C-alpha cells in the first residue's frame, strides 16, 4: 500500500498500489484509486489505504449514496466537501463495526480526495486515521499514504507546484520503483491518473502491470543510470580512513 | 471445514464441505452453505466456518427472522446490505452466549455472503471474526474460508474473473481434492452452488457424496496426471549434487 | 386564479390557470403549477391559490431546501409527508409576515400537492388556508382551488376515477373555458401538467396560450354544440305558462 497524489499547476496526478494485507497469510490485490463525476462538471478521485474492510465499505457508501437523494459526491458544492464527506462517511463506519467482536484490532484507514467541480480550481486533501485532514498548497504539493518514506526522497528533490504533469507521473513512478524494491507490502499493479486542469472531463486512467514496455523500461534505465553515477562519484579522501 | 466462493462474469460460484467439529470426539456433518430468496427478484448465499454454536444461531436467527416484518435477508435492498445483516446478527449472537460460563472457550465464525438483487449485479462479501467485511472483485476474484491454504494454490494459479463458471467449479472440485488428502478436519460430502448472472433463480444446489462418479474420476484422473507429470519432468543438471 | 387536479385509476392530471391579483390596478400573470423531482425514483407536483406573497415565499423555500441536509421534496418518504412538508411550511412563512404592519390584511393560501413517490401508489392532496388538508379518493376524484364554482359542474357529471387522461385533461379544458368566460380573475395562459401511474418520469407539461390551435378549436365546437342542444330541447307544455 502506497499512495501518491499531487496538485500542480497544470492539473493533478495520482497514483496507486494494489497489494493489499487482507487478512493473516492473505495478501492480495485490491484497486486503491477509485473515480466520480459528471463530464463537463466535476472530476472526483478517492484513494485508500489502511484497513482494507473499513475502507471497502466507505467507497461502498459513498457509490450506493450517489445514486440517491441528499449528500453526496456527485452534488457536494466543493472539493473541500467532498473530502468532509469521506471524513464523515469514515466515522460512521468506524461507529457500527467497533464492539467487544473487534477487540483491539485496528480499524482505521486513511484516503487521499482531489479533483475539481465546476467554478472552482482543482484541489487535493488527505485524510488522517482520526477523521481530520490537510490540503496541498504549492509549497507543499504533493501528498503520500501508506508505505510512503522509501520514495519520497525522489519527490522532496524533484517537484515543484510548477512541474508539468508528464514529468510528475515519471517521478511518481520513479517513487514506486524504489519502494518496490526495498518494500515487499508495496506491489504491482499500479493504478494511475492524469487530470488536466479546467479540463472537467473524468480520464479513463490507466494500469502499469509486470509486463508494461514503458515502466520495465525506465527502471531498467534509472538502474544504469544510478549505477553510472555513482562509479564515476569522486572517493572520499585520505582523511576519511 | 473449507468454504470457497468465487466472484465471475458469468455470475458466481459456491462450494463448502461439511466436516465440523462439534466438541471432544465427536466430529460430525454439517451443512456450510445456505440459500435464500425469492424466484425473479433475489438469490442469497451464505457459508459458514468456525464455531458451529455460533453460526448455527446466525442462521437460524437469519431464518426465523424472514418471517417477520423488519429489516431480513428478504428485504435488504443490496448484497453489500445482507452482508452487513449477517455481521449485525453475528455481533447480537456473540453479546448474549459470551459470560464467565464461556470462559476462554472461542465462539468466533466467519461468514460469506453472496448473491444477486434485482435491478444491481451480483456481488460477493468476506465476513471476518471480528465482523467486518470485504469484497471480491476482478483482481481478487475469489475467497475462501476455514483450512484453505492447502487448495489455494490451484487458484490461484488457474482462476480469475474471466473464468467461465463450469471451469471456475472443477477447479473448486480440485481445490478439494489436495484440501481433503491432505488435511482430516476437511471432509465430504460437498454442497455446490453455481449462479447465473442475471438469471434471478434460486439454483438447487448439488451435494457430492463419497460415491459421485463424476467427482470419483477427475480425482483418478488428476492423480495419473500429475504422477506422468512428475516422471516425464527433466533431471537437475550435474550442478545440484 | 382556478386550479384543478385529478387523481385517476391512470394516474394524475393538474391544470392552473396564471391571472394573479398581485395588487391594485397590476393584475399580472404568475405560474400557479410547480414540478419536483428526480427521474426514476418520484413526481410531486404543487399548485397554488390565494395571496401571492405568501405562496411564493413557500414555494421559493422548498426549492431553496430541495438543494439542503434535511427536510425536503426530494427525501420526504411519501406523498403525505410532502403535503405535510408544503402544510409545515406555509405555517413557518404566516408566524414571520404576520405583525402589526400587515394589519388585516388577508395572507392566506392553498396549495394542492400531488405525485408518485416510488414503492406507493399515485396520491393528490388539497391543504386548507388553514393548514389542514385531504386526499382525493376514488368517490371525489378531483378537487379545485381559487374560483371553481363555474366550472365544477362539468366535472362533477363526467369525471369519475375510471376516465382515463386525455378525457380528463380535455374535460378540464372544458371546466376552464367555461370560468374564463364567466370571471375576468381567471385567464390565460394555463399550465398542464399529465402523469402516468408508475412511470416515475418528470413530465415537461404544456402551456397553453391565447393562440392555442387545439384550445381554440375545442372552444369553437363547444359552442356550436351548446347551442345547438338547446334549439333541439323541447319546448315547455301548456301548463308552464
Chains 1, 2, 3 share one sequence.
Not at 526495498?182 to 504491482?188: A, D, F, I, K
Not at 491518473?193 to 514496455?213: F, K, N, Q, W
Request: charge should be negative.
Amino acid at each position: 500500500t502506497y499512495c501518491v497524489a499531487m496538485h500542480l499547476a497544470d492539473g493533478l496526478v495520482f497514483a496507486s498500489d494494489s497489494r493489499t494485507n487482507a487478512g493473516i497469510d492473505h495478501i492480495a490485490t485490491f484497486r486503491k484509486l477509485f473515480t466520480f463525476g459528471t463530464p463537463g462538471e466535476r472530476l472526483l478521485v478517492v484513494q485508500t489505504a489502511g484497513n482494507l474492510a473499513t475502507s471497502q465499505s466507505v467507497i461502498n457508501l459513498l457509490q450506493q449514496r450517489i445514486r440517491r437523494d441528499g449528500a453526496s459526491l456527485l452534488n457536494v458544492p466543493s472539493v473541500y466537501d467532498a473530502t468532509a464527506l469521506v471524513a464523515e462517511t469514515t466515522r460512521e463506519v468506524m461507529a457500527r463495526d467497533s464492539g467487544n467482536l473487534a477487540g483491539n484490532t485496528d480499524l482505521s484507514c486513511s484516503f487521499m480526495v482531489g479533483g475539481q467541480i465546476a467554478g472552482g480550481p482543482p484541489a487535493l486533501y488527505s485524510i488522517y486515521p482520526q477523521g481530520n485532514f490537510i490540503q496541498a498548497t504549492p509549497d507543499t504539493p504533493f501528498l503520500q499514504l501508506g508505505e510512503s518514506k522509501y520514495g519520497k526522497p525522489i519527490l522532496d528533490r524533484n517537484l515543484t507546484f510548477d512541474t508539468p504533469l508528464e514529468q510528475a507521473l515519471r517521478c511518481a513512478l520513479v517513487s514506486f520503483d524504489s519502494t518496490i524494491r526495498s518494500n515487499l507490502s508495496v506491489g504491482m499493479p499500479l493504478d494511475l491518473l492524469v487530470y488536466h486542469r479546467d479540463s472537467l472531463i473524468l480520464p479513463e486512467g490507466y494500469r502499469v502491470t509486470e509486463d508494461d514496455a514503458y515502466f520495465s523500461a525506465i527502471r531498467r534505465q534509472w538502474s544504469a543510470g544510478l549505477h553510472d553515477m555513482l562509479e564515476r562519484l569522486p572517493s572520499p579522501p585520505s582523511a576519511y580512513n
